[model samples]
Target: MDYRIRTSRDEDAALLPAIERSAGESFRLLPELAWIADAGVAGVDFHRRLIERGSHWLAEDADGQPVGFLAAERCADELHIAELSIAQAHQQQGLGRRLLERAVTYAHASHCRALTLTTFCDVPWNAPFYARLGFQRLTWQEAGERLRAILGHEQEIGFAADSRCAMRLVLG
Candidate 1:
């Protein structure tokens, strides 16, 4: 299945949540995240906003259908990755990495602070995978006010302590 990456458009908004839902199926294997596998997905309006700002990219199948997406936002001089997910059938095919590298390139070229994200600490495909991509875990003491607030927001939204971390790839 050949796929291409492209900037997302406003019309692409409605299709992303379903891609997220499908991608979350991988979480079921973790047991502890079974409930979250189906919860708290971003809404279409959210996608619309990102798309409008050229902060969204899509992996499109040969037929031009989206199977994965990466959405980010400018956060206090950093590009904060809001979500990155590939449909289960498209997992492990490097689609996610390709999309991620696009974001890394974008941030680096823009001279942003870094590429930032929050992810599970112990998941093999989470923090470990990012470590391979040059991201370093940040200590809470190292988190600036904005980053700290972002972490706090994650906790407020039910991300459990000791399970997730705020990470950054220094691009500056």
Candidate 2:
């Protein structure tokens, strides 16, 4: 469980889709995302794009295999956390929180205002988990244009809006 955090490499990009699939198993417990279990993880090309953005981080096990990752993008003044997932075997080990902390550090280093993400409000491992990390739910008026678009797209993609929310962890 002792792992190191590092920026993702091109070679690392190829391994992510599988990790994502393994991570998606955690969603099987939630009916809201059950359909997502069959849908493919983002393609390697998309992972490449995020990697190229210089905002992707990976958590590697003692053997250097990535068990988790956090992908983010610079959206105006804040870093939008696109994804943070840990393989089932790695769950409950704090790997996901460690990944988020890395993003928080990066946000602070880059002078970003906060780390923002959208997640299921009703899922214990989603918004509630984020709340434990100090992230606050954002109202529509507080979401700003970019976050609103992100949420809008989530709804358009079939995610249940009633259970989804945008959250932000403002950097100190």
Candidate 3:
């Protein structure tokens, strides 16, 4: 399938949560994390705030319907990726990599120091996929205060402490 990557418009906000849910369905494959497949997703207001900051991008099929989205926010000199979701039907097609590439391009152009995100360490498509893209895992002591807080909050919200880790991709 041919897909186009584009910056998200305000109208695109309403369509993102569904894509997140669709993407989350993949978590069902992990028995320990299956609950995430049916967990509540970020709301429209959350997406809208990122879109307003020009940190949101959408991957749309040839017909121009969104099937994935990358939501990030500028934090100091880094671009923190809050979410990168590709609908289950669109998974394994490189759309996720394309979305991250778009984010890398944007971060570089904006003079960001790095791109950061936290994910399940053992999930093949999570930390490993990012590692292949040059994102290095950050140890608890190495993670910044913000990243630490984020990880702490993830645990507070039910993520397993031993399963999650923060990663960063340095940019020029």
Candidate 4:
């Protein structure tokens, strides 16, 4: 692989909008007007409260061009792979798998017993790809407190509500 991964901090705060843009471009969390109302606040809030403080890895080329990022927060023994986003221009090149491999490696090295994350249950690369990587899908009711909290208390995202899957991989 020609990409290198590194941790992120407050200095990288400027990139949160870019990540959110990539996400919105790829997933349908909400519509235009609703997104206009929520995307900015929600996106920046994640960077401020989660990504910058958590186990975040940024994928960059030799020239320091950031092509992708994975952010997760640790809660006790489980590390949640929150967001794995590759720039639209960099899609379909195995970058996402590479990021996931890096995340799993970091989780193992950190002594985390398992890994967890959520994604669109039916999306081609969302749930199915993780299943291929050994993640078993968990029903919403089957999710424990940690996973539930990580997913938030449940507001409403319209599309995100019933279409996502909470997945877990046991690695201990």
Candidate 5:
């Protein structure tokens, strides 16, 4: 599979939510978190906002169809990833990693200090996957105000508090 990683365009925004929903279907493999498969996703406007910031990237199949995306934003000196999703059909094919690499390259070029995100701590494809990419899980105190607020928002929006964690990959 020849996958291309590219910065997202305005027209690509509307396609993101569907891709996210398709990727969310993988959550069905975890009985306890199965509901996530049917949960609402960030919509077109959200993706458009990220795209406007020039902080979103898409993974496209050789046929030029988008199979995955990474939505992120600049928060001070850090590039915070708001979402990373690969369609179930494209899962396990390295598209997510490639998308992240694209974001990392962008962040470095933009002189960002780090990459950050919040994710399910115990989910194999969430925290563990990021850990493998050299992102370190941060404790509450270590997470700082911004990341802590993001974690708090997730909990307020129905995510389990204990299951969620903030992670950062320092760009040094």
Candidate 6:
């Protein structure tokens, strides 16, 4: 399938609904969830909010459907992965990787010295996927305030059975 990266537009707002239309139920069942509220997604405005004053990446299928996205911004010492999402059917298709590659490129261009994010420590893509992609696990003590903020929402969810983790990748 054809895949290209581009900025989000108002027309792309439908992608948020498309995610739920296709993978909402599965995502809702996951310990961690993406509650979009009125935010646009799949590179729409809501996703844009995640990367305010930063960058966002979108991967569209050959048919022009939004399949995956990555949002990030260059901060004091790192490029933060604001959020990443892929439609369930599109997982394992390499679209998420491409979006991440683009996001990192944008971060480097913005002069971010490292990369950081938080995820469920034991989840499939939470640690292993990023580790395979070269991210390293950071101890909770080293997470600092920025990483803590990235995890703020998940903590507030107050799901007794769920927990999140913080991970980082130093770019040098």
* Candidate No. with top lDDT: 3
| Each prediction's whole-model lDDT (CA) | 0.88, 0.87, 0.95, 0.72, 0.92, 0.67
Q: Candidate 2, residues 1-172: lDDT per residue as tens digits?
A: 4889999998999999888889889778776678876766778887899899889999999999998899899989989998887887888988888888888888898899988998889878888889988999999889888889988988887887787899999887
Candidate 5 lDDT, 36-118, residue by residue in tens: 99989998999998889899999999999999999999999999999999999989988888888999999999999999999
Return the top candidate by TM-score.
3
Those runs of model 6 whose alpha carbons end farther than 4 Å from true positions after fitting are 20-45, 50-54, 159-162
lDDT assessment of candidate 5? 0.92
Candidate order (lDDT): 3, 5, 1, 2, 4, 6
- The alpha-carbon deviation from the true structure for residue 82 of candidate 3, after best TM-score superposition, in angstroms, is 0.4
**Model 5 stretches with alpha carbons more than 4 Å out:** none
Worst 10 residues of 1 by lDDT: 141-150
The local lDDT score (0 to 100) that residue 119 gets in candidate 5 is: 95
TM-score list, all predictions = 0.95, 0.94, 0.98, 0.79, 0.97, 0.76
Q: Which is superior by lDDT, 1 or 6? A: 1
Residue 145's lDDT within candidate 2 is 89
Model 3, global lDDT: 0.95
For candidate 3, the per-residue lDDT at 132 reads 92
C-alpha-based local distance difference test score of model 6: 0.67
Candidate 5 or 4, higher lDDT? 5
Clashes of each: 0, 0, 0, 0, 0, 1
Q: Which runs of model 4 end up more than 4 angstroms from their true locations?
A: 28-45, 48-54, 149-155
Candidate 1 lDDT, 16-116, residue by residue in tens: 99999999999887788777787878999999988887878999999999999999998778999989999999999889999998998888777787888
Consecutive 10-residue window with the lowest summed lDDT within model 3? 163-172
Mind giving the per-residue lDDT tens digits that candidate 6 earns over 1-172?
5677776555665565566345433445453454423233344555547545546667778888777666666678687886777777887777777877887776777777778887666667667888898888776678888776656765665422245677877776
Candidate 1 error regions (>4 Å): none
Model 2 CA deviation exceeding 4 Å by range: none
Question: What pairs collide in candidate 6?
Answer: 40-46
Provide the lDDT at 62 for model 3.
93
